Amino acid sequence: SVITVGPYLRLHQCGLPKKMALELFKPFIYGKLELRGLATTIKAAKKMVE
Amino acid sequence: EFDAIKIALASPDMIRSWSFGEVKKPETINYRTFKPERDGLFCARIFGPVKDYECLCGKYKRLKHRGVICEKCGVEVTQTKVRRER
Amino acid sequence: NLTKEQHEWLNGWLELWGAWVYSGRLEKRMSSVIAKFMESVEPGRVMTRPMCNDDDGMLISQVVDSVMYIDKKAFGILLSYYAHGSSKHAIASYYHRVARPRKMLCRGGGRIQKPSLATCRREVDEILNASLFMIYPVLDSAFKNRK
Amino acid sequence: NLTKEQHEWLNGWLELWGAWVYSGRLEKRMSSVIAKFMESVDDDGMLISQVVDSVMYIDKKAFGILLSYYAHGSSKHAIASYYHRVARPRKMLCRGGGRIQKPSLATCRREVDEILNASLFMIYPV
Amino acid sequence: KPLVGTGMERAVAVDSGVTAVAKRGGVVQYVDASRIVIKVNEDEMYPGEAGIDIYNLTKYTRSNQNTCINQMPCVSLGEPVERGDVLADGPSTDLGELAL
Amino acid sequence: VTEVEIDGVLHEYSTKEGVQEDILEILLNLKGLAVRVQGKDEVILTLNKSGIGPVTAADITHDGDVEIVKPQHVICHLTDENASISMRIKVQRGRGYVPASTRI
Amino acid sequence: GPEEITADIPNVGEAALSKLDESGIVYIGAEVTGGDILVGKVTPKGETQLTPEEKLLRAIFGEKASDVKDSSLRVPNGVSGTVIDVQVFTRDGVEKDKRA
Ligand SMILES: [Zn+2]
């Protein structure tokens, strides 16, 4: 996507939008979400992240 | 697993060793129904299972029959991945 | 033990459930021709098991988790029965192969064996017979609680 | 169970019987189900029609099946085919199990066979 | 409208036909959001076929680029109009002037 | 103002026969409408107006607890001799800038 | 066989069913979100259309059978908005529907 500034950051870090994060890390969400047992099976986690 | 890449010019019987059949007919598909034909371009009995562990006519519909060829068209049951490289 | 109608009604909900979760299978197979090969034929065996919506399947997923979180063996055979659709005898075979000679002491004597395949059936059956009976009044209220 | 001479005997009787009826030579007054079949198109056929209507009066489904096989002359395989088409899920202690689903074709073939044998069996002494 | 104009805005607003221009000089009879009705003045009225002017405005429709193209009445009722004058502000047009 | 239900209208992106204005311009005119309420936290106002002319702020059915402040604030012009509008204007208290999408 | 347009569907909840008409079409102005169903389209997989032996035994047994699939037009993901217009074009000699 398109860049913008946000100067309040320190330089060892960058901004990232919540939607793109929630899309990019979906298998990690599945993994830790299975770990905590908030949903047992996978398709449960599918509809939880949906 | 493997070292260096080697190339060479191709012997004829090397090419015969590579194949599993000869193509003979200039059609490819039915167009009427949608079937692949006997020895056309998209062939089953030369190239393999267009379906998955299953025959063209559907003679061997289960994973148990794995290993034996069919007889109504004569195709060997394997994965459909195997039609990518034969 | 539960009743006959309860076994029917709950049984229908569970087959819709494991049908729903079975659709969340990791991967299948298919091809790039077979769909074109598929629409103009009548297949025969419609393997399309029907399932509920996401609301019910999610809800009763919360129910089955909510009771069945304590035993993972009973949960696993539950998914074996409705998810894969496999029979009791089939998982009697799967389970009997690797039941593990755990030195269970019978009324015969001290023995070093699997309990038999004749044993493993009623092993399986007393599990889910109790299990549905455990989860039934919870779920029967749960549709009413949404109601 | 019937014998096979009874099978061929009453079989031939139902052949000339259905060939007699299906031409339309029978009246509405024998059955409203016979009338129903005549909506979907001699004393031997009327005597036997009293017999068959008397015995198979009470079911009317296998009676209509009986008209389909004998009056119309349909194959058994098509009858079990459409019958497998109209199937509902039922409880059967299957080769698969006591789950509730639509049965197979060969089961439907078995059912047409046994409703045939029981139908002919209930007809024959009458 | 833009404050620092360049004088061309009348011309490009008119010659773009996304506005609706009075073909004859007349007086407004009936204003509506959808249609507009002009009584034709007598001098420009043809001797045979007296008639009146009725223009139908383009409402919300899909552009080539998926944007809203729409026309709005900019005139009042009971009002003399001129032949060759703006009646409908189309999209990004204001009072006969082009304004992005 | 919170929400407006004008009668013969399916949705904001259409018109109404009998008024020169679009719906969209009308409710953006209502966005600037100011009013004073005392005894409640929410209230529903109602206007009914026919006949040719401008639609002012005066045509609402006023109460004793609600109070418009600018009677001259126009909404629209009726252009037909016989057409009318009948909306119900829901008005509540609040604090800050709230877009319509962030609710519920 | 053909394909059908009606609100009959296999196996979705009543949430999307709330916002269709009796013909399977969203009303004008129903605000929808992504993933919602605009028009319920289904295919009869397994329709017969056979000989009058069939229609005979359909008259005998009833018409129960040949119902499966769904290909409903769904809203694209992440977009939302408001329906403002429905267009229907119908091939000639085909029965027009109620909303049409
Ligand atoms: Zn074959």
Domain of residue F94, CATH code: 2.170.120.12
Question: From CA C74, how far away is CA A50, in angstroms rounded?
Answer: 29
DSSP-assigned beta bridge partners for residue E62: E68
Per the structure, the count of domains in chain F is: 1
Sequence-ordered strand ranges (E) for chain G? 31-32, 37-39, 73-74, 81-82
Q: Residue D92's Cα: distance from chain center in Å?
A: 23
Decide if G81 contacts G36 (C-beta within 8 A): no
The CA R_g of chain D, rounded to the nearest whole Å, is: 16
Mutating which of F3, F9, F12, F13 best tests the G interface, going by the most G Cβ atoms within 10 A?
F13
CA neighbor of C33 nearest in space, from B85, B56, B74: B56
Question: From CA D31, how far away is CA D38, in angstroms rounded?
Answer: 10
For residue G95, the 8-state DSSP code is P
Task: State in Å: Cα B54 to ligand 1 middle.
Answer: 9
DSSP A6-50: -TTS-TT-----HHHHHHHTHHHHHHHHHHHTSSSSHHHHHHHH-
- What is the arrangement of strands in the sheet containing E85-89, beginning at the earlier edge strand? E20-22, E85-89, E72-73
Nearest C-alpha of chain C: how many angstroms from D96?
A: 7
Q: Please classify residue E22 by burial: count the beta carbons closer than 10 Å to its beta carbon, then call 0-12 exposed, 13-18 middle and 19+ buried.
A: buried
DSSP-assigned beta bridge partners for residue B76: B69
The CATH number for E66's domain is 2.40.50.100
Where in the sequence is the domain holding E33, given as residue range(s)? 18-92
Decide if D20 contacts D45 (C-beta within 8 A): yes
Kindly list the distances between the CA atom of residue A39 and the CA atoms of C55, C71, D32, in Å, as whole numbers in the listed order: 14, 15, 60
- What is the arrangement of strands in the sheet containing E26-31, beginning at the earlier edge strand? E53-56, E35-40, E26-31, E80-81
Where in chain D are the domains? 1-126
Nearest C-alpha of chain G: how many angstroms from D105?
A: 14
Question: From CA D100, how far away is CA D91, in angstroms rounded?
Answer: 5
Task: State in Å: Cα D102 to ligand 1 middle.
Answer: 27
Where in chain G are the domains? 1-94
Kindly list the distances between the CA atom of residue B19 and the CA atoms of B46, B47, B86, G26, in Å, as whole numbers in the listed order: 9, 9, 7, 57
Decide if E23 contacts E82 (C-beta within 8 A): no
Annotated binding site of B: 55, 57, 70, 73
Mark out the alpha helices in B19-86 (DSSP H runs).
Answer: 44-47
Give the three-class secondary structure for F54. Answer: strand
What chains are in contact with D, requiring at least 3 Cβ pairs below 8 Å?
A: C, G
Where in the sequence is the domain holding F43, given as residue range(s)? 1-104
Question: From CA D36, how far away is CA E68, in angstroms rounded?
Answer: 63
Question: From CA C21, how far away is CA C51, in angstroms rounded?
Answer: 9
Q: Does F14 touch chain G (CB under 8 A)?
A: yes
Q: What distance, in Å, lies between the first and last C-alpha atoms of chain B? A: 22
User: Which CATH superfamily, name and number, covers G1-94?
Assistant: RNA polymerase II, Rpb2 subunit, wall domain (2.40.50.150)
Say yes or no for a CB contact (<8 Å) between C50 and G12. Answer: no
Mark out the alpha helices in chain F (DSSP H runs).
Answer: 23-31
Q: Please classify residue E26 by burial: count the beta carbons closer than 10 Å to its beta carbon, then call 0-12 exposed, 13-18 middle and 19+ buried.
A: buried
Decide if C114 contacts C123 (C-beta within 8 A): no
Point out the residue among C50, C54, C55 whose CB comes nearest to the CB of G10: C50
Question: From CA D30, how far away is CA D21, in angstroms rounded?
Answer: 11
* Residue G23: CA count within 13 A, CB half-sphere: 10
Decide if C125 contacts C74 (C-beta within 8 A): no
